[PDB]
Symmetry: C2
Subunit: 404 residues, 2 copies
């Protein structure tokens, strides 16, 4: 019989990545997997306009209920795209919505490796980007001279109801930005447990990355991680030989971590950072490794029922330049490994979170990975890694499908 796919949200995009995933679903998945349990959503920039971001609020609904999501790269309907695609209106990045709609704790940005192919990092690297707070949710104004005041009124504790001044300053410039933001730190307890759990499993030395020396408000991010590590993980890490006795959890300053990403070409490490630091450091990580596509973008949130909501996406966009090449009858060679790593993760999580056909699903997803890696070893991968004698997009799809 075919493998019974567990309930999973499948978010289709457009352009080259949608063309490639249609071939992957048709030729790799569907012959071997009953995907009846998949809930499919059309996130074409058009369909987000045409439905007024209904299809987005429906994806978020399906996500909270099913807890496993594969998302293809999508076109954010920015002002440039409204004109190009003849849309009616402009719409924001879906990330903030998904990060809050699924109680996000982290975006896992991990190095993708190919057995038999050497990339920038020799061994796996793990990165945890705090999924919430910071400047991504800042309120702000561009102003000239005047007085800026920030007050806080606690709702609890011995000073409930008492308004206190957080900051007051005189702006003395004719052109200035004034900015307020918050970092919610309650879920850093869960982030710590998730991160250290993953790092132990992977046998990588974990590091915590902040600017807490100057940005002193960041101290809790560090203190919560050290506390969870010392009480719940330091023993297991010494026992597994990842860390020696007496060795302590190391904090790295954000600016220093940019230097460690370049130095530490052996890999075998893990880092956890705030939202913005993680955005910037993970792109540096991508470039040292190979390119954006060679890092995951795996959102992990916490359901009210205590299980994890996990969304998986490739770290590249829809590759419109290649879709143009295709529609000019020029050969293409899209490496689908980034998106396949995402689909594997989604299918695996769906099987685990629902307890449906776990053994067969994990065996199939592992075989897909093993088959792809072996083609790359033989010089039968895509042209990004195998050079000009590498296979086209379609030749690669067929090469994998024959070997499943």
């Amino acid at each position: 019989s075919k493998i019974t796919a567990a309930p999973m949200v499948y978010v289709r995009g457009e352009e080259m990545t949608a063309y490639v995933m249609d071939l992957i679903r048709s030729r790799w998945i569907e012959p071997r997997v009953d995907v009846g349990g998949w809930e499919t959503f059309d996130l074409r920039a058009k369909n987000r306009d045409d439905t007024e971001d209904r299809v987005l609020r429906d994806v978020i609904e399906a996500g909270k209920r099913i807890k496993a999501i594969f998302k293809e790269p999508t076109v954010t309907p920015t002002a440039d795209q409204v004109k190009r695609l003849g849309l009616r209106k402009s719409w924001g990045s879906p990330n903030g919505a998904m990060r809050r709609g699924w109680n996000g704790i982290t975006i896992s940005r991990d190095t993708i490796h190919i057995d038999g192919v050497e990339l920038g990092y020799k061994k796996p690297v793990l990165f945890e980007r705090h999924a919430v707070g910071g400047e991504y949710s800042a309120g702000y104004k561009n102003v000239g001279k005047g007085k800026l005041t920030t007050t806080f009124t606690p709702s609890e504790g011995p000073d409930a109801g008492k308004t206190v001044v957080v900051d007051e300053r005189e702006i003395v410039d004719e052109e200035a930005a004034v900015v307020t933001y918050h970092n919610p730190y309650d879920n850093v307890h869960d982030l710590a447990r998730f991160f250290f759990g993953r790092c132990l499993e992977a046998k990588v030395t974990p590091y915590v990355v902040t600017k807490k020396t100057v940005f002193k408000w960041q101290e809790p991010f560090w203190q919560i991680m050290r506390t969870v590590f010392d009480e719940e993980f330091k023993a297991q890490f010494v026992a597994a030989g990842v860390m020696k006795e007496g060795e302590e959890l190391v904090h790295l300053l954000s600016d220093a971590a940019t230097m460690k990403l370049v130095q530490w070409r052996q890999g075998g490490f893990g880092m956890a950072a705030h939202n913005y630091d993680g955005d910037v450091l993970t792109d540096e990580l991508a470039q040292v490794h190979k390119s954006p596509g060679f890092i995951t973008s795996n959102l992990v949130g916490v359901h009210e029922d205590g299980t994890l909501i996990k969304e998986f996406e490739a770290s590249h966009g829809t590759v419109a330049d290649m879709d143009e090449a295709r529609l000019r009858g020029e050969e293409t060679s899209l490496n689908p490994l980034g998106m396949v790593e995402g689909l594997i993760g989604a299918m695996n999580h769906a099987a685990d979170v629902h307890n449906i056909d776990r053994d067969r699903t994990h065996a199939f997803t592992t075989k897909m990975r093993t088959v792809i890696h072996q083609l790359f070893r033989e010089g039968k991968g895509t042209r990004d890694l195998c050079g000009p004698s590498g296979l086209t997009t379609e030749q690669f799809i067929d090469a994998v499908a024959e070997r499943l």
Copy 2:
């Protein structure tokens, strides 16, 4: 013997202070009268003992003299408070200097030696906005409650009218609440400094921000682009850097981290906000070779319009080599990054005070040429020349010999 102009000299500790003591004893003092040098003891212990009056005195001296050389220093963090037996922890001196001297820019440029291959083939220039952002934030660590940010303009048609900038319910038992500002008036000055340096160096300039998401940053780009288009674009075309119709490029901060790893040919410049510049200049140093292979020059302005310039190396005091030294063992400290700082400071001191201009400039040029030439001959330090490289004292003597 050269009469040194008035200059502030900020002394540190550990390996770097020992190295600079020798440089002064063997290279400077036998050829230069350093009467005009005002020296300041910025040991962590001296910051702690004077309750930072020594840092207050450095800022007052810098405003008066306008030319500052600063050795690497130990910031009195909680760990250094333990290690050095201090009474209190203290912040870095940087905020005090950058704000105290009306900072505009921190210029952080790759250090190059003809005939020595480092990470970037051609010079790279970086302009970090010296002030603003989270470096001057107010903040609290709080629980649940209501956070309100108001602004009252003092000028214009809405003067006196308090407006709401932000209002949000904090729903977490543990949260940071943060308010900061970006002062953009001196970005007009940053832009002219940056594009002029890039034009001189013939490098392609880029502006780096997160303005697509952090939209309050839009003016940083608009000010720079307006200055570029009005004052510099045609010059960039005529210098062979850019083609007609090519526009100034904006890079997102996260994309710029990728470009620093990719663009190993160098020949580019980047301008960024304070924090973006902090992280990118550390990345820049590492791709080039190491922390000290980047200059660090703060440019500010006195209320009388005279530029205040401070110069330092981009490395620390290298405690580990001081330890190895005190154990009688061999060291190899490359002093080029520190000497580039001293050269800039003495050159500015000479230019601002008009004291022995011609001879100071010749001595500073010779110091650099003598150092660079020794590296070309495999008689540099072991960081560039390998084990066959000279020791700290051997390198100091070798340079002394050739002046």
